[PDB]
């Protein structure tokens, strides 16, 4: 069982294994698990590495796929590696011919997303999803695709905002960061580190959401007694983006609740 | 001795009592007391720029009713 996403188990069993004793923290967390289980009875534990944000998002997005999203169906997406790299030679600083491997990764993302969206049975989609998330080359090639998608989306927004056009506010704040002022700094100092030395900042969860066009609805358990107990990324997305629901004990770790 | 707003990504808004001679270090010190956020995880944004620790607030012409933006690092 090479699974990077654990077989689902009852969510009250999980929390009760995880959180014992009556400290304020524990009780806060108990109340958060109670909140989730009102709508979701089971949880899938997501490998706690630096890819957690991406693993939890891609596994949910893909296991609930009933059709292929148009941004992925667009054949022009395959030609995007060449187009960006020819333009912005600086992209060769990518941390894993670079056209070719990035191209294989999108190709893989589409074939697998398309394989899944064609399945009738649940059992079938889940067997096939389980068998893609086994810590093997294919799994981490998918993150390479999602991350590349993220750079692209960040490049487009940077360009829109220099020409004065309408940009979601988060992208302002994404490039106001000392070490992410331009797409180059973003790749060298942030995107490259992702899955190797860190996960996604909250600002980059916006970015992840824009890249895969999925609204990310997160129970942030350590914010239970505040208005951010559920945080949605991005705050106000288009009405048509599918929704992935995640739980998180902190902003570096994310798991999947299961049912509703 | 005036006040400023400090907004965050999701839409929660923090109010702070402040003084112009407050270094940035001091503003970050007040955010943690109010909101429990370590100062080494904070980035404060005003008018599109990142504010630098040992500068004051009267260095960025930050006025009463000024709205800054918090952009957080991962721990």
From Swiss-Prot, chain A:
Keywords: Acetylation, Angiogenesis, Cytoplasm, Disease variant, Hydrolase, Immunity, Innate immunity, Phosphoprotein, Protease, Thiol protease, Ubl conjugation, Ubl conjugation pathway, Wnt signaling pathway. The record marks 228 as: Linear diubiquitin binding. Ubiquitinated. The active site is at residues 49, 52, 253. Changing residue 168 to S: Severely decreased NF-kappa-B inhibition and increased NF-kappa-B signaling. One of its GO terms (molecular function) is cysteine-type deubiquitinase activity. The specificity for linear polyubiquitin is given by the 'Glu-16' residue in ubiquitin chain. It comes from Homo sapiens (Human). The keyword Hydrolase applies. It catalyses: Thiol-dependent hydrolysis of ester, thioester, amide, peptide and isopeptide bonds formed by the C-terminal Gly of ubiquitin (a 76-residue protein attached to proteins as an intracellular targeting signal). Changing residue 19 to A: Decreased activity toward linear ubiquitin. This is Ubiquitin thioesterase otulin. Residues 18-19, 47-49, 169-173, 197-203, 250-252 are annotated as: Linear diubiquitin binding. Changing residue 186 to P: In AIPDSB and IMD107; decreased stability; impaired ability to mediate deubiquitination of linear polyubiquitin chains; loss of NF-kappa-B inhibition and increased NF-kappa-B signaling; does not affect ability to interact with RNF31. Residues 41-260 form the OTU domain. It is linked to Autoinflammation, panniculitis, and dermatosis syndrome, autosomal recessive: An autosomal recessive autoinflammatory disorder characterized by neonatal-onset of fever, neutrophilic dermatitis, panniculitis, painful joints, failure to thrive. Patients do not exhibit overt primary immunodeficiency. Changing residue 90 to S: In AIPDSB; decreased function in protein linear deubiquitination. One of its GO terms (biological process) is protein ubiquitination. Its EC number is 3.4.19.12. It is an enzyme of class 3 (hydrolase). Interacts (via the PUB domain) with RNF31 (via the PIM motif); the interaction is direct. Interacts with DVL2. Belongs to the peptidase C65 family. Otulin subfamily. The chain holds residues 78 to 346 of 352 of the full protein.
From Swiss-Prot, chain B:
It is a peripheral membrane protein. There is a cross-link at residue 1 (Glycyl lysine isopeptide (Gly-Lys) (interchain with K-? in acceptor proteins)). Transmembrane segments: none annotated. Changing residue 1 to D: Impairs ubiquitination by CRL2(KLHDC3) and CRL2(KLHDC10) E3 ligase complex. Residues 2-75 form the Ubiquitin-like domain. Phosphorylated ubiquitin specifically binds and activates parkin (PRKN), triggering mitophagy. Phosphorylation does not affect E1-mediated E2 charging of ubiquitin but affects discharging of E2 enzymes to form polyubiquitin chains. It also affects deubiquitination by deubiquitinase enzymes such as USP30. It comes from the Eukaryota. It is found in: Cytoplasm; Nucleus; Mitochondrion outer membrane. The modification ADP-ribosylglycine is found at residue 1. Exists either covalently attached to another protein, or free (unanchored). When covalently bound, it is conjugated to target proteins via an isopeptide bond either as a monomer (monoubiquitin), a polymer linked via different Lys residues of the ubiquitin (polyubiquitin chains) or a linear polymer linked via the initiator Met of the ubiquitin (linear polyubiquitin chains). This is Ubiquitin. It comes from Homo sapiens. The lineage of its organism: Eukaryota, Metazoa, Chordata, Craniata, Vertebrata. The gene is UBC. The chain holds residues 76 to 150 of 685 of the full protein.
């Amino acid at each position: 069982p090479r699974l990077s996403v654990a077989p689902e188990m009852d969510i009250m069993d999980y929390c009760k294994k995880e959180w014992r004793g009556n400290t304020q923290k524990a009780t806060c967390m108990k109340m958060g698990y109670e909140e989730v289980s009102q709508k979701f009875t089971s949880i899938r534990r997501v490998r706690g590495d630096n890819y957690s944000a991406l693993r939890a998002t891609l596994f949910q997005a893909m296991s609930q796929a009933v059709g292929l999203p148009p941004w992925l169906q667009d054949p022009e997406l395959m030609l995007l590696p060449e187009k960006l790299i020819s333009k912005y030679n600086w992209i060769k600083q990518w941390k894993l011919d670079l056209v070719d491997k990035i191209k294989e990764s999108l190709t893989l993302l589409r074939k697998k997303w398309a394989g899944l969206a064609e399945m009738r049975t649940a059992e079938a989609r889940q067997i096939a999803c389980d068998e893609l998330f086994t810590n093997e080359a294919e799994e981490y090639s998918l993150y390479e695709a999602v991350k590349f998608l993220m750079l692209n989306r960040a490049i487009e927004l940077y360009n829109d905002k220099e020409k004065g056009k309408e940009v979601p506010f988060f992208s302002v704040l994404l490039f106001a960061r000392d070490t992410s002022n331009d797409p180059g700094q973003l790749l060298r100092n942030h995107l490259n580190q992702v899955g190797h030395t860190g996960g996604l900042e909250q600002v980059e969860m916006f970015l992840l959401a824009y890249a895969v066009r999925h609204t990310i609805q997160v129970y942030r358990l350590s914010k239970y007694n505040t208005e951010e107990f559920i945080t949605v990324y991005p705050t106000d997305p288009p009405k048509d983006w599918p929704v992935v629901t995640l739980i998180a004990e902190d902003d570096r770790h994310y798991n999947i609740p299961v049912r509703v | 001795g005036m006040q400023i707003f400090v907004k965050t990504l999701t839409g929660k808004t923090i109010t702070l009592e402040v003084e112009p001679s407050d270094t940035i270090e001091n503003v970050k010190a007040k955010i943690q007391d109010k909101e429990g956020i370590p100062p080494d995880q904070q980035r404060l944004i005003f008018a599109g720029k990142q504010l630098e620790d040992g500068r004051t607030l009267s260095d960025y012409n930050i006025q009463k009713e000024s709205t800054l933006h918090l952009v957080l690092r991962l721990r």
